[PDB]
């Protein structure tokens, strides 16, 4: 539910604080949280909307020119002056031209020639500012238990279906309670202000295409720029470089415009996020939110249910997810009522001993008409095992086999941890964050190292970093002093920063 | 313009060959069309401006 097939989901087990677990939410995947005796909840960050942005400094990327004019002077007079130089709509350039005795004045030095041309911009891109307030996150969460496989990617009614909830989170209301009927409520305390750097990212539009763009990239742009409120007649601070003033072989001047610039900016944009826009609001689909889950008002609906014993029919097959788990969809035949579903990963045929873990909380069918559908999943052992569902004489047993021993599992866990650290920085230390002292010390030292590293490096992209990494690798390899480690150590970071993304 | 006949062969843009009788056939089909990928569920196609 929500995350069976996400393929970027991770399991946060238990709550050694008894009440809460800290969790970082990301757009790519989702988090399935399973407690000791509480229903498993799958949580996913869905969209981040930004609202009422303020236009700032719109640029012009396609210029157009108009009626040129010019003026010349004697080799010994003043300087040329067109009366269209007192108009802030004309680009004007002054140079020296060969004059004399053929051209119209008796003297032979260099004259002075001024040429002016009217500037007009058909379209310009504009950037808008994003305050870290007035931006909203929308979290979708769902619960395991009674849902049939159909209700995995179906978002039509979550108001009344008792098992799914939607939570809106803004700086003005950073905490919420997701009410799940019969399950109680999951408290959710989040940090919206600090999720993703939204104090340096302008929103950029060119023509119905929108990006997230850093500052200092939307200020070091050499293009004619207005300064905010376009009101009447447009004014451009610089018509410079959108207009090229060449001159012929010392006896003319020529004004041309450079063409439309809209492909240079597309290439200049790299490492800038894609965003879309609905009305006045902008939807970003790549983000980073940190939420602590107060999971102390969650109950188990199935407790005090007499276990159903009619029959169980597989409906689709037992399937294996990407992470090792196993999903099963069962149909119940003879209606008893609301009742507990028996299921386990068993081994010895006589002493059905629960081996492995079941990650579907406790299954219970809530409908009794004739036949019902439900979906559960479970984490079977690495060896052969049996999926056993039923009570007596009708326990349809399936033979399951898992591939990879614990060693590969730990390797993959380390890989995921490394990737999450590379993506998030110090915040990665908060993913499973019940909270001790080793965790806080690690987070603090990571904060200091990340600040230093981002100050020194972190002005480069995948090639300068690979080059400097290899160079420092050789350097530390052959320096023979006591700094060797430092050099090599720095590269690890650098190198993984290049090979993990 | 006048262009060196080595700057006009290392150009990464869709190129025809010779004059066009009708609608041209362009061989590259890339370096102007970008197939970006959503977060593991979609594909989107954009053109560079």
């Amino acid at each position, epitope marked *: 539910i929500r995350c069976i097939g996400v393929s970027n989901r991770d399991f946060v087990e238990g709550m050694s604080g008894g009440t809460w677990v800290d969790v970082v939410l990301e757009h790519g995947g989702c988090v399935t949280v399973m407690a000791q005796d509480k229903p498993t909840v799958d949580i996913e960050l869905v969209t981040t909307t930004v609202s009422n942005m303020a236009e700032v400094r719109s640029y012009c990327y396609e210029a157009s020119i108009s009626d040129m004019a010019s003026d010349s002077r004697c080799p010994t007079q003043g300087e040329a002056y067109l009366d269209k130089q007192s108009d802030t709509q004309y680009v004007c350039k002054r140079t020296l031209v060969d004059r004399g005795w053929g051209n119209g004045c008796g003297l032979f030095g260099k004259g002075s020639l001024v040429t002016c041309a009217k500037f007009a911009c058909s379209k310009k891109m504009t950037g808008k500012s994003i305050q870290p307030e007035n931006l909203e996150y929308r979290i979708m969460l769902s619960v395991h238990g009674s849902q*049939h*496989s*159909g209700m995995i*990617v*179906n*978002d*039509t009614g979550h108001e009344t279906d008792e098992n799914r909830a939607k939570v809106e989170i803004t700086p003005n209301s950073p905490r919420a309670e997701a009410t799940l009927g019969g399950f109680g409520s999951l408290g959710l305390d989040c940090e919206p202000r600090t999720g993703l750097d939204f104090s340096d990212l302008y929103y950029l539009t060119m023509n119905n295409k929108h990006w997230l763009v850093h500052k200092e990239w939307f200020h070091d742009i050499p293009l004619p720029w207005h300064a905010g409120a376009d009101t009447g007649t447009p004014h451009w601070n610089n018509k410079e470089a959108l207009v090229e003033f060449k001159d012929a072989h010392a006896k003319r001047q020529t004004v041309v415009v450079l063409g439309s610039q809209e492909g240079a900016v597309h290439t200049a944009l790299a490492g800038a996020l894609e965003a879309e826009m609905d009305g006045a609001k902008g939807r970003l689909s790549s983000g980073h939110l940190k939420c602590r889950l107060k999971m102390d008002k969650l109950r188990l609906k199935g407790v005090s249910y007499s276990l159903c014993t009619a029959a169980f029919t597989f*409906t*689709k*097959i037992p399937a294996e997810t990407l992470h090792g788990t196993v999903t099963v*969809e069962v*149909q119940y035949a003879g209606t008893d009522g609301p009742c507990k579903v028996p299921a386990q990963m068993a081994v010895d045929m006589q002493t059905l001993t629960p081996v492995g873990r079941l990650i579907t909380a406790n299954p219970v069918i809530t409908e009794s*008409t*004739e*036949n019902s*559908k439900m979906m559960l999943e479970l984490d079977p052992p690495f060896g052969d095992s049996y999926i056993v569902i039923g009570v007596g004489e009708k326990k349809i047993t399936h033979h399951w086999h898992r591939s990879g021993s614990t060693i590969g599992k730990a390797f993959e866990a380390t890989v995921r941890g490394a990737k999450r650290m590379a993506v998030l920085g110090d915040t990665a230390w908060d993913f499973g964050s019940v909270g001790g002292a080793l965790n806080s010390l690690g987070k603090g030292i990571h904060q200091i190292f990340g600040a230093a590293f981002k100050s020194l490096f972190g002005g480069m992209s995948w090639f300068s970093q690979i080059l400097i990494g290899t160079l420092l690798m050789w350097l530390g390899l052959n320096t023979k002093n006591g700094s060797i480690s430092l050099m090599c150590l720095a590269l690890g970071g650098v190198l993984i920063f290049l090979s993990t993304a | 313009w006048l262009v060196h006949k080595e700057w006009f062969h290392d150009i990464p843009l869709p190129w025809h060959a010779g004059a066009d009788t009708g609608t041209p056939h362009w061989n590259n089909k890339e370096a102007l069309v970008e197939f970006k990928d959503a977060h593991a*569920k*979609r594909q*989107t196609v954009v053109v560079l401006g």
Partner: antibody, heavy 121, light 108 residues
Framework: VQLVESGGGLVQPGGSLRLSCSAS????????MHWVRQAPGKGLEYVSA????????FYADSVKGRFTISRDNSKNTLYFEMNSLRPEDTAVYYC???????????????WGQGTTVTVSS | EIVLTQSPATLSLSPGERATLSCRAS??????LAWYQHKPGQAPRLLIY???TRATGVPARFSGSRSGTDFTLTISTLEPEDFAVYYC??????????FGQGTKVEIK
């Protein structure tokens, strides 16, 4: 939640026509739309489809090339611009819609009343 | 393309009799099959999706079952408003979707 269809009528062979389907009562953008036609005395034929966002479109071989499906999420309207009509296209056309999270897939649908399109002969 | 074949072309039954319709796919559809009820002068009405799941408001008498490639729609107690044409539709991976040729449930 309803779909009201319009634009059916009489047309000459080789002629053209545009059918419209106005959606109400739901977030149109979250619904994949489909066109299914039924000739007189014939079974239903699934002919065309478009994703919720308009990104991509699908056409059955029986219509691929002549018919164009489109949608405007601001006007909440689905369109089936069918040109080069043939007498074999004389049928009742019904636009259907289903909440979609993946390009065309849907589980529970909603149907309009249908509109008759008659090739002249 | 996948094809759906409904076995009975036309079925004649008295009111209250059991009604059975079978739809066979040319290839595996694991759990994706829908059943629709279509009355003349009316839009086709969705009855069952995912083979055995009843649509919203569909009475409990309509039941769906699957076995490999053979799907079955069962009507236990026929009521007069049930005599119409019934279609099966494949909801497998791609939009290429085929509606069966349909079966007519008639009042013999």
């Amino acid at each position: 939640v309803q779909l009201v269809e319009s634009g059916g009528g009489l047309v000459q062979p080789g002629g053209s026509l545009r059918l419209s389907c106005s959606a109400s009562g739901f977030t149109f953008s979250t619904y994949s739309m489909h066109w299914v036609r039924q000739a007189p005395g014939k079974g239903l034929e699934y002919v065309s489809a478009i994703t919720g966002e308009g990104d991509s479109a699908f056409y059955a071989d029986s219509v691929k090339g002549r018919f164009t499906i489109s949608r405007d999420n601001s006007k909440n309207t689905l369109y089936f611009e069918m040109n080069s009509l043939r007498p074999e296209d004389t049928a009742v056309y019904y636009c259907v819609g289903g909440y979609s999270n993946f390009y065309y897939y849907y589980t529970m649908d909603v149907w309009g009343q249908g509109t008759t399109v008659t090739v002249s002969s | 393309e996948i094809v759906l074949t409904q076995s009975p072309a036309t079925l004649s039954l008295s009111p209250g009799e059991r009604a059975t319709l079978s739809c066979r796919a040319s290839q595996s559809i694991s759990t994706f099959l829908a059943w629709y009820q279509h009355k003349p002068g009316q839009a086709p009405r969705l009855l069952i999706y995912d083979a055995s799941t009843r649509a919203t408001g569909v009475p409990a008498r309509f039941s769906g079952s699957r076995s490999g490639t053979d799907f079955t729609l069962t009507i236990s107690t026929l009521e007069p408003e049930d005599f119409a044409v019934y279609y099966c539709q494949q909801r497998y991976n791609w939009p290429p979707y085929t509606f069966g040729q349909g079966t007519k449930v008639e009042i013999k």
